[PDB]
Amino acid sequence: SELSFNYPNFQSVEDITFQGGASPRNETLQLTPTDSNGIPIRQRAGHAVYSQPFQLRDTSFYTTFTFVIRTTSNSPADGFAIFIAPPDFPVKRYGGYLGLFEPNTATNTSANKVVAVEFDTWVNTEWKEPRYRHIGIDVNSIVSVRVTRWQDKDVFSRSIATAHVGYDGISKILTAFVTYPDGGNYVLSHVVDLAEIFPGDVRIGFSGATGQYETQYIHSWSFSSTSTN
Amino acid sequence: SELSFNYPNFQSVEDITFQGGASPRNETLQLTPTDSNGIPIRQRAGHAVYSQPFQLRDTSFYTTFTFVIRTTSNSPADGFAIFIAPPDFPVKRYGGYLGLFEPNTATNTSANKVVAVEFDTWVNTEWKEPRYRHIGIDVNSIVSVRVTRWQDKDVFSRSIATAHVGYDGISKILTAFVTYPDGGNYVLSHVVDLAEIFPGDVRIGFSGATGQYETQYIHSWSFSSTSTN
Ligand SMILES: CC(=O)N[C@H]1[C@@H](O[C@H]2[C@@H](O)[C@@H](CO)O[C@H](O)[C@@H]2O[C@@H]2O[C@@H](C)[C@@H](O)[C@@H](O)[C@@H]2O)O[C@H](CO)[C@H](O)[C@@H]1O
Ligand SMILES: CC(=O)N[C@H]1[C@@H](O[C@H]2[C@@H](O)[C@@H](CO)O[C@H](O)[C@@H]2O[C@@H]2O[C@@H](C)[C@@H](O)[C@@H](O)[C@@H]2O)O[C@H](CO)[C@H](O)[C@@H]1O
Ligand SMILES: [Ca+2]
Ligand SMILES: [Ca+2]
Ligand SMILES: [Ca+2]
Ligand SMILES: [Ca+2]
Numbered sequence: 001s002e003l004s005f006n007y008p009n010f011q012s013v014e015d016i017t018f019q020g021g022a023s024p025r026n027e028t029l030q031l032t033p034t035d036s037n038g039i040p041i042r043q044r045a046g047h048a049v050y051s052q053p054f055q056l057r058d059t060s061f062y063t064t065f066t067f068v069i070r071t072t073s074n075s076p077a078d079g080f081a082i083f084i085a086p087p088d089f090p091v092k093r094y095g096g097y098l099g100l101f102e103p104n105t106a107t108n109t110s111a112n113k114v115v116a117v118e119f120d121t122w123v124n125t126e127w128k129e130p131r132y133r134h135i136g137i138d139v140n141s142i143v144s145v146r147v148t149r150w151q152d153k154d155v156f157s158r159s160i161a162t163a164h165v166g167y168d169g170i171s172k173i174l175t176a177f178v179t180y181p182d183g184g185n186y187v188l189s190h191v192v193d194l195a196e197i198f199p200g201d202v203r204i205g206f207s208g209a210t211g212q213y214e215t216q217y218i219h220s221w222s223f224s225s226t227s228t229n
Numbered sequence: 230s231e232l233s234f235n236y237p238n239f240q241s242v243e244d245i246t247f248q249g250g251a252s253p254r255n256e257t258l259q260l261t262p263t264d265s266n267g268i269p270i271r272q273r274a275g276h277a278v279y280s281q282p283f284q285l286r287d288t289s290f291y292t293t294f295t296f297v298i299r300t301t302s303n304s305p306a307d308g309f310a311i312f313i314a315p316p317d318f319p320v321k322r323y324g325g326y327l328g329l330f331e332p333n334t335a336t337n338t339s340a341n342k343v344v345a346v347e348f349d350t351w352v353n354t355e356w357k358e359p360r361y362r363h364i365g366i367d368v369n370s371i372v373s374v375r376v377t378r379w380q381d382k383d384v385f386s387r388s389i390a391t392a393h394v395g396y397d398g399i400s401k402i403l404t405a406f407v408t409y410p411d412g413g414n415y416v417l418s419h420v421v422d423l424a425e426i427f428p429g430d431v432r433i434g435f436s437g438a439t440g441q442y443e444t445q446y447i448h449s450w451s452f453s454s455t456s457t458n
Contacts, residue, residue, distance in 0.1 A: 062408070164406055166404065168416050175395065175416075177393055188397055189395075189397040189404055189418065226414075
């Protein structure tokens with residue numbers, strides 16, 4: 001279906017729903033919480049999602065957002081993702097699960113219905129993932145179907161980074177381009193029929209998790225979807 | 230292989246190779262020529278190509294540029310493209326061939342080695358294309374393998390528009406995202422193994438053609454390629 005929205009900042013959150021440990025703070029989406037001294041709280045997850053459902057049948061979409069990861073250590077955890085799931089998808093487990101999965105079914109594709117672009121700051125050995133920090137595309141599993149190295153100079157830049165995420169409903173291809181000012185550029189694509197996975201309604205939004213010594217912020221976000229008929 | 234470059238504008242055109250009717254003009258790349266009164270000259274083609282070659286085996290790349298199409302009537306022709314080609318690729322035919330094909334082989338995928346993202350202002354009936362202005366991915370043929378409607382409001386906006394083109398060398402997927410400020414967003418993707426088409430050096434650049442009543446300008450441009458090792 002057709003939907004568009006545009007948040008240059010989050011002084012308004014009229015149509016944003018916050019769950020779990022996410023909240024609106026300093027004109028941003030703050031995905032995980034901090035205590036009264038600004039210290040990230042451990043083992044928390046949260047979601048900030050656009051509140052209106054949409055459909056993926058015969059649809060392409062384009063979305064772009066800017067983000068900051070604030071780390072206070074050389075060993076931050078766990079990252080964040082932009083995701084799509086049914087409208088009643090809840091905040092799931094903290095830590096390496098990124099608010100999107102739970103331990104007993106995290107790598108079981110038949111037990112999940114969630115697609116995401118993850119920004120993964122903590123190398124987990126509890127399931128298969130690369131031995132360095134990475135950006136990936138997740139289809140129904142915490143084990144990414146396409147994954148690439150995220151350079152530490154970018155992870156730790158404290159820059160306002162940009163993501164572009166698009167879905168071509170004709171070719172059935174999800175793509176992310178991530179850019180850093182005077183930094184790295186990242187390109188990932190994967191063939192996935194989202195309308196097959198999601199024959200009804202979905203919502204799009206962000207999930208963040210700790211971990212430790214890391215807060216994830218969304219500074220701006222826009223979206224448009226169009227019929228491919 | 231690895232290459233990066235950045236033109237925030239075209240005050241400098243070092244390492245741009247101009248061919249045909251393309252020239253530097255007013256800190257932009259002007260792809261087709263105008264007379265000393267600024268009127269678009271009919272039936273002309275022009276290339277503006279980054280001078281240094283790169284290779285596609287085990288490589289991904291990201292590139293972005295801004296552009297303006299100036300029209301002097303409601304019947305502009307023919308558009309422009311960003312393209313990759315082997316060394317010493319010549320300026321080809323003006324008109325609907327976009328500077329990238331010759332009439333006798335324009336639809337023959339066995340007789341061309343050129344990959345492009347085209348912005349097509351003139352509906353041609355001499356070969357198959359949509360009945361409306363369109364953005365397309367071209368693989369070895371003027372008949373686009375993935376093609377989408379380009380809305381006239383955007384064509385005639387006089388806006389500085391942005392294109393993002395990415396190639397994921399692991400999944401073998403070329404993607405374009407095109408955005409207009411306060412206008413349309415466009416998403417196209419295609420599965421193509423570029424290293425199989427281009428086994429040696431390639432160069433990246435722009436080709437523009439008339440036609441009539443149209444000049445195509447590139448205002449800024451950046452590019453990075455990295456190894457998928
Ligand atoms: C599955 C999960 O969410 N793990 C978290 C978790 O992992 C840590 C943590 O469990 C501590 C408890 O003392 O023990 C380990 O450090 C564990 O990390 C795991 O094992 C280590 C030895 C390495 O192999 C590491 O790759 C692996 O993940 O907490 C951390 C933050 O401390 C993250 O939040 C993980 O995702
Ligand atoms: C193949 C090519 O490069 N076509 C150009 C060309 O096409 C014109 C042109 O050939 C004039 C010359 O008198 O004749 C026709 O207008 C032709 O347009 C073609 O035929 C018409 C009837 C339509 O069906 C149209 O879709 C088709 O292109 O010049 C035009 C600008 O006038 C463009 O530059 C084409 O790409
Ligand atoms: Ca991961
Ligand atoms: Ca992880
Ligand atoms: Ca065309
Ligand atoms: Ca045409």
